């Protein structure tokens, strides 16, 4: 018996990739001008059918951590935000002397001087501000506040038609690249997945938006699920994805409105027009969450052994991070997550109040502040809490009481939430084999 080099073409061989990835969605209206920050049909509507197929016997090592998609989405999405914002008003005529008054707590009632559409008249103009929009200019004086950015950053108000609303995007692999899906729920993002599949384009990944708790991202099965880079790095992020959904309906109880002023001749700014005044709040009835967490603690113990566990508040660090935070409509919430994370979990026989903000420092960048448009609505939220960005106490605190706090430790990790199932890969069609032959 003897042998030659032969090549079969297109045989399935693949490896991890720095490859770029492009959006798809259903067509929301087909027109390029459809109001949206993620995919206003500037993303091409590639086939909304995931024409996926089974990887029968194909065992693959996944890697959720050296994945390319996290950095890619993280860079991409920030760029989407910028190229939705550049078309709308920069707010260089907005850092100014602010006068404020105190009213029924932490929603200040305010007025200031500014240009109009004419570059002459100091128009006196009026707006509400949630207190965390501002700082004192130099001293504790009623006329003397500035917008919280101006200290180090410029701001940009999106047209109220850039809707932050999370329409799904599907990342497609371009041809000669592919997406492998771990086709099991009983799985974590490092080592083998035994059951698997492939698709050209991800099943909808929420563009999500979360800060501390996973919103809108789907559930698991078999058990509650935990994912982390290395669980022995107590500081680095731990993701929980629940086997059960939970739903939160946060509300601005205040009948607050789009007033509008022309801060220059093409520059429509949305001032916050008022109606009693109460703090933003949410309903999530304790006992569903409580016994959900009781089982989360068990999946955590499946690593740690038999510890009584606590979930406790985020604390000390920047409120932009240390509250749980998300959009509803076009305004941003910042909730004292303590009311849902101040809780204790034995081994044996075992609702949030919130603040609104208008200015945000999204993705923790320098510069490029966003002042959110005050929405015309008694704004409401209708959304699923579905998972937890836990951080485990860095205090190794030997073997009695080990514990966690929720964190916003990376918005990359807010994406990892759903990304974990997808391994983006190159296909190499280079099928060398022994056979025998002679040229025709």
């Amino acid at each position, epitope marked *: 018996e003897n042998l030659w080099v032969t090549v079969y073409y297109g045989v399935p061989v693949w490896r991890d990739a720095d490859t770029t990835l492009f959006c798809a969605s259903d067509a929301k209206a087909y027109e390029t001008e459809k109001h949206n920050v993620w995919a206003t049909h500037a993303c091409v509507p590639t086939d909304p059918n995931p024409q996926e197929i089974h990887l029968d016997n194909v065992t693959e090592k996944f890697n959720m951590w050296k994945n390319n998609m996290v950095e890619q989405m993280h860079t991409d999405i920030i760029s989407l935000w910028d190229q939705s914002l550049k078309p709308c008003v920069k707010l260089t005529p907005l850092c100014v002397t602010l006068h404020c008054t105190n009213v029924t707590e932490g929603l200040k009632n305010c007025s200031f001087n500014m240009t109009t559409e004419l570059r002459d008249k100091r128009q006196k103009v009026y707006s509400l501000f949630y207190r965390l929009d501002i700082v004192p200019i130099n001293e504790n004086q009623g006329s003397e506040y500035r917008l919280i950015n101006c200290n180090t950053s410029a701001c940009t108000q999106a047209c109220p038609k850039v809707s932050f609303e999370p329409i799904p995007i599907h990342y497609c692999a371009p041809a000669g690249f592919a997406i492998l899906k771990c086709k099991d729920e009983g799985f974590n993002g490092t080592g083998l997945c035994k059951n698997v599949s492939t698709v050209q384009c991800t099943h909808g990944i929420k563009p999500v938006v979360s800060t501390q708790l996973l919103l809108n991202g789907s559930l698991a099965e078999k058990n509650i699920t935990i994912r982390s880079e290395n669980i022995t790095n107590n*500081a680095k992020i731990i993701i929980v994805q629940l086997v059960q959904p939970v739903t939160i309906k946060c509300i601005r109880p205040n009948n607050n409105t789009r007033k509008s002023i022309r801060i220059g001749p093409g520059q429509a700014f949305y001032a916050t027009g008022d109606i009693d005044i109460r703090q933003a709040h949410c309903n999530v009835s304790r006992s569903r969450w409580n016994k959900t967490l009781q089982e989360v603690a068990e999946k955590l113990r499946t690593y740690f052994g038999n510890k009584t566990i606590i979930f406790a508040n985020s604390s000390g*660090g920047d409120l932009e991070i240390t509250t749980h935070s998300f959009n509803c409509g076009g305004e941003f919430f910042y909730c004292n997550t303590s009311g849902l994370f101040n809780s204790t979990w034995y081994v044996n026989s075992t609702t949030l109040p919130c603040r609104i903000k208008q200015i945000i420092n999204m993705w923790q960048r320098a510069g490029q502040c966003m002042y959110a448009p005050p929405i015309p609505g008694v704004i409401k939220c209708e959304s699923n809490i579905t998972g937890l960005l836990l951080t485990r106490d*860095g205090g190794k605190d*030997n073997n009695v009481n080990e514990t966690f706090r929720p*964190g916003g430790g990376d918005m990359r990790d807010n994406w990892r939430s759903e990304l974990y199932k997808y391994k983006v890969v190159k296909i190499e069609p280079l099928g060398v084999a022994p056979t025998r032959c002679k040229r025709r």
Partner: antibody
Amino acid sequence: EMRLEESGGALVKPGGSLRLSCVASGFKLSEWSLMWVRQAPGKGLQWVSSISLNQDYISYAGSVRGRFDVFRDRTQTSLLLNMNKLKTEDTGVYFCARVHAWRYFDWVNRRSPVEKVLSIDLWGRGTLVTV
Amino acid sequence: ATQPPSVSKGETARITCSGVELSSQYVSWYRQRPGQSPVLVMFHNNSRASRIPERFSASDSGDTATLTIAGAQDVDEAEYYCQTWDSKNYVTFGGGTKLTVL
């Protein structure tokens, strides 16, 4: 058995400057942490500061040590304390110790999840420094 | 956070450091004889005194780190302090005490 050791000092000027560095023995110095104290005269004990293992894992104590500086260098003996604008508050025996830890230092800080363990192992002789 | 500021011969020493409230991994204490350096006694139960053989321990009241020196008839040796680092990048000490014997 191992001995933890530093530079000779001086009867330093008030408002003066000084340097003291590791000259310890019995082990590979090998990035193991700087650690020292203000053993203030006739008092108990107080920190040197927060401290470095490999350089860049150190901090002042509070705002208080901001007038001083701290180093490691490629030369492992330069596990060093640099002293400037010296106060009567700076004074004491600068005894020093090995540290029972080997890691970096950071996270979202204040009271939130930094793991990076710190700890004092065996201890050796130091110089009484006063104005 | 601190221990409070005598014994007769043949008794054994026991002192709590915290100052009405302390918890968690913020636990440590180091002995001294004046003129000598300070001296390791305990860090987190697996780093321990070279010269009190096996005769010292941690313990808690619900609010204390504790110099549980309960077998140290090597008792003339008694001056001690506590230390930790768990605050904002910040080392910390318990102000310590002697105990005379004779």
